[PDB]
Design a protein around this nucleic acid. Structure first.
Ligand SMILES: [Ca+2]
Ligand SMILES: [Ca+2]
Lengths: 184, 186, 181, 184, 182, 184, 184, 177
DNA sequence: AGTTCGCGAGTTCGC
DNA sequence: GCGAACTCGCGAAC
DNA sequence: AGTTCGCGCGCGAACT
DNA sequence: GTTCGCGCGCGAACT
């Protein structure tokens, strides 16, 4: 639910920072690259992922949304939890990790401590395949559950909703028109 | 617990927005109609429902309280979870969904992907009577029934306070008077 | 954890209010007496109890800390949950409820819908004694609260007093109690 | 997740305080030493530990991070929960508790009500070794070990980094991690 | 897991029996029709459904497999638990209940205490439910699409002299599965 | 589910027995009165209650069904678990316990170790009301199925008058249920 | 816990059988090959795996221990539950499934309905390496199974198989290796 | 609940046996010393401990009740589960383990794989010290929740008309007024 | 007509 | 496109 | 080793 | 003064 924490850095440690937002100091477990520019007394915005478990609520902090999304993708692999996903991002930068998934570079993934040959192969197996107005509307309709390329049918059908040629009429209006059509 | 998030729109995506309220950016999964209202850099108040599960805390955002309440009504139907309730509100507007429930229009509900004939019939079955479309009386009686009072005992207490020393108190004032009377009764 | 919510009242309903504190609108299920002075657009501070469950996080709001503490006392009775504790506080004011517990007035408790003779007797059984109607008494109470026996708590306080501030006396009594090294 | 609460002290009781941070009054169960510095109407920042359970979310407040970290160390001992860890910090200051752990002073720990000979021995057993010139080296090695690296591989990478360009600890950690992620 | 309990009836009550099988007396909550022929000291076989929960292990007993399967079908309806499913079978016999589901007879279901108009409508909504047909049904049960199940079963229309009607059902199923696995 | 265990008594201890039924030796925690009748090498049938929990499956054994049912009634009281219910039956016989509930004899219940004044009052409160013979039994079974007492009396009376007045309890129950299922 | 059920076959259905063992009829969900050998009225011993869940206790039956062990190996793969593991054994015989794992034959595994390319790759990834000199290998395997390091297991087994043993059963050699390993 | 399984040994492996009791073959994970005398086709009685968890029901088998009780004592130590308790009993016999606890022999316990210095110290801390008619009756009364002094006072009062079961029944009748 | 009680998944994959 | 099936990762230790 | 693995509550009411 | 034992309330019936 918490996608970022912005406020005064109260503490910077080698594995976390405390950021005070509206009087609340949030402990954010962060990668060394996210912590790099953080200094005590300075204002900072850390991009975060909140992990909720029965006996814990923990924030993980990243230098950007790309690394945060990679952390969440790592977390979706069975056998990979928050500590291992953070260790992976501490060793590999976003581009290096994204590259290792595309090239099935099990050897670089095993450089992360806690990730052995089996774990690296599971990560590659799970994340290799999981790593303009028309494309966005189709993507949003597929995201809503309109499967088997039916999103393409109702999006190309709203080719009449441009009488005075509005360029693209924005993705928000093109999606509302396709959804209106899909609901009969 | 969280019924709204107000602040700077940091991001608008096709299925969610990030709204920063007092330094915290909240990811709010929102319907396309709620997202149409949002633009990066603007201040916005998104009406929300917080869904708490053992391993998750998620905010769902709507253009108004009416759609948020309909999302919560959809969630109460067995077989309908947050993703399906959001897909339903993305396809049907508040009035159209309130209409399909009254008319038992299973065909319109089946237009929502993930909702088949069985699911549509479950939704209609569960929500037809739990949906809407002097006024003081009905509101007070409804609040007394909501507290656990039997409708007859709720009507009697409301009428005793609205017909006695009233004749045009506020609804909450009449509710406190009806509750005061119900706690004596004996 | 949340003991109060202060901010702009965004909505007032007959059973809840929405209060916006630092951009977040909190739904607070409140008693009719807590809602009485609340008006949309007005600033208000509602005294609250946060109830956490596997699939829920809910705030309950009261006109004062006394009613909030009575709600928490009602929750500690087996068979009484948040809805029943709120219904009890909607029917009985703090003084009336505290009185009914002391006098074992099962009939008044039975006026609350959802509370029958058995439930009223369980509430009276559990909360009569755990309900009400200076430096020494407070320090002894804090030591007992920490786990010290009432006998040992009284010995360390009187010893400390002969040698005011309640916190200062508590720190001195605790320093004395930890002496055996 | 919550490491501190800062705001107006609305209430000071003998076992807790209410601190209002941005309109929210947080109940913080605090040690008598943490409550000693709190006074109604004053602004205060209380250092906290949030304990999350299936049916509860509770804040515990301390006079400093040292006592808060000792509370968290006490919580990690089986048989020691929040009430017993608070009673231990109410009876023993940060220095006395760390001294009793180093000296295996079971008798001092037994002074805390609720802790008997068995409990005191469990606490000593669990926390004696888990309790607290090139300081940069030791910190970097400790952070690498914390990420999952073996101490020998952590020392080798840190030394290769501090011996080649003989500045900051976080900067040296990022250099050691960069080196450790090399497939060579 | 336990589909029947056979042994000495140690106790017969109006809502349960105790049946001793291999030295263990099993309490079996049973419908009045299942209990009807049971007598203390007599041997009996009760058809059962074992319901496992975090804090309980309970046996429910029926006069036959048809009623036991109807109890399990009732349990699959949200809002219907073991007590309500037993009350339903105590009021309605298997044929009467199966009839009420087909005819959407909400009024008859409403005769069962604990089942109101809403519950009866949920139950009706949820429960409105030779070698070739059996093999296809078993293939569909394994996850095969009905069309792919029919095609594989029909392709095994071979066998000189040995039963022109696709030999034994288990033999035809093994042949259809062998074909489906390439 | 297990209401009795019959077989060879392999062991008799002060708080339990092992009874072998068809090759399986079952440990049955039993009251001293249930153990009094058990002797190693003898065949015995112990009346039992199986208590199932997430991490345990335990058998409790009694001299008869009356004590076993009283154990189950004690278990239904909040604050009373298997150990306390066994301690109660070890101190009070079936008749004495049934008497103490009727007379609200909190002092006798307080004689059981682990049961204080509060616990004794909870037990009395919960079990005082809980712990034409054909008519009463049929009505009780109909009420047990969920029928309202008035509708249960009306159906039972319609059955016992007309084609009865002679007509077993179970037979009358099946007739009352047949009548109750008649539409309108 | 239940590894087999032996008794009278009361019922044979297309997907399960009921086998009565000492008065209890057990429903055993079985593969079509396991059901092929079952006939109503006959005595049979079905090799089983009991799957325990919070709300269920289910028996799965196989023609032999080899298929039962393969079912348990399939269950250990994330994404593969009892229904999918049974469907796999209904389509592929033992050693045919064992072959597809060794040869990474994802195409044969995808013939099982419910198993797609991703699932087949997960199964292959997880089970390829898992699913006199024979005495030595078995003893070493049992020592490794107990937690011993393979080198320490080989050293103890070799010290035992050379000296007081030259010709000395596998279990006897295991007890001798364990006796040696427990010496300080 | 299951304290023993007696029947035909269907299978003997190096870490478990299958014993058929009344038609049910029970897999019993057993120590090598418990398996030593077991042979396929032979009747055997294995002393067991049933471990119940949300997703499992497992039997552990031992050569006698002493080893089974030691397994249960090991299970009560935080950090020690069934696998580690079985590995401990596979390496150390009942007498050797009981000795190592009394003498705080952390080095012997550390010989068990999976048990390091910390684990061995936890086991020793939890299990050292923990752990005729008059003594038995007092022990049974204390086991029921009675105070050690109250148990001794009641049993000694039973020396007016005086069996360990008849003495316990007399002391329980005097303790309940 | 109230107050004990009985009851309690939602997707992303695959076909 | 809908309906079922299916559902950990760290500290301590090899 | 640097890996899959085996493993997992504390409060208070009663007695001490 | 510290081991162990013990641990849930609503929404629909239907009174
Ligand atoms: Ca509750
Ligand atoms: Ca375990």
């Amino acid at each position: 639910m918490i996608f970022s924490v912005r406020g005064e850095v109260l503490e910077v440690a080698l594995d976390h920072a405390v950021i005070e937002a509206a009087g609340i100091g949030y402990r954010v477990n962060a990668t060394p690259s996210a912590l790099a520019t953080l200094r005590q007394g300075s204002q900072a915005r850390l991009v975060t992922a909140m992990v909720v478990r029965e006996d814990s609520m923990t924030l993980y902090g990243f230098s950007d949304a790309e690394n945060r999304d990679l952390f969440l993708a790592l977390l979706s692999v069975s056998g990979v939890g928050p500590r291992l996903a953070m260790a992976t991002l501490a060793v590999h930068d976003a581009a290096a990790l994204r590259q290792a998934l595309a090239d099935s570079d099990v050897a670089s993934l095993t450089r992360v401590p806690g990730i052995g040959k089996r774990g690296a192969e599971r990560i590659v197996l799970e994340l290799r395949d999981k790593v303009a107005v028309r494309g966005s509307v189709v993507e949003a309709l597929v995201g809503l559950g309109f499967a088997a390329k039916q999103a393409e049918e109702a999006t190309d059908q709203v080719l009449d909703g441009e009488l005075g040629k509005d360029g693209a009429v924005a993705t928000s209006s093109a999606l509302r028109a396709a959804l209106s059509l899909l609901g009969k």
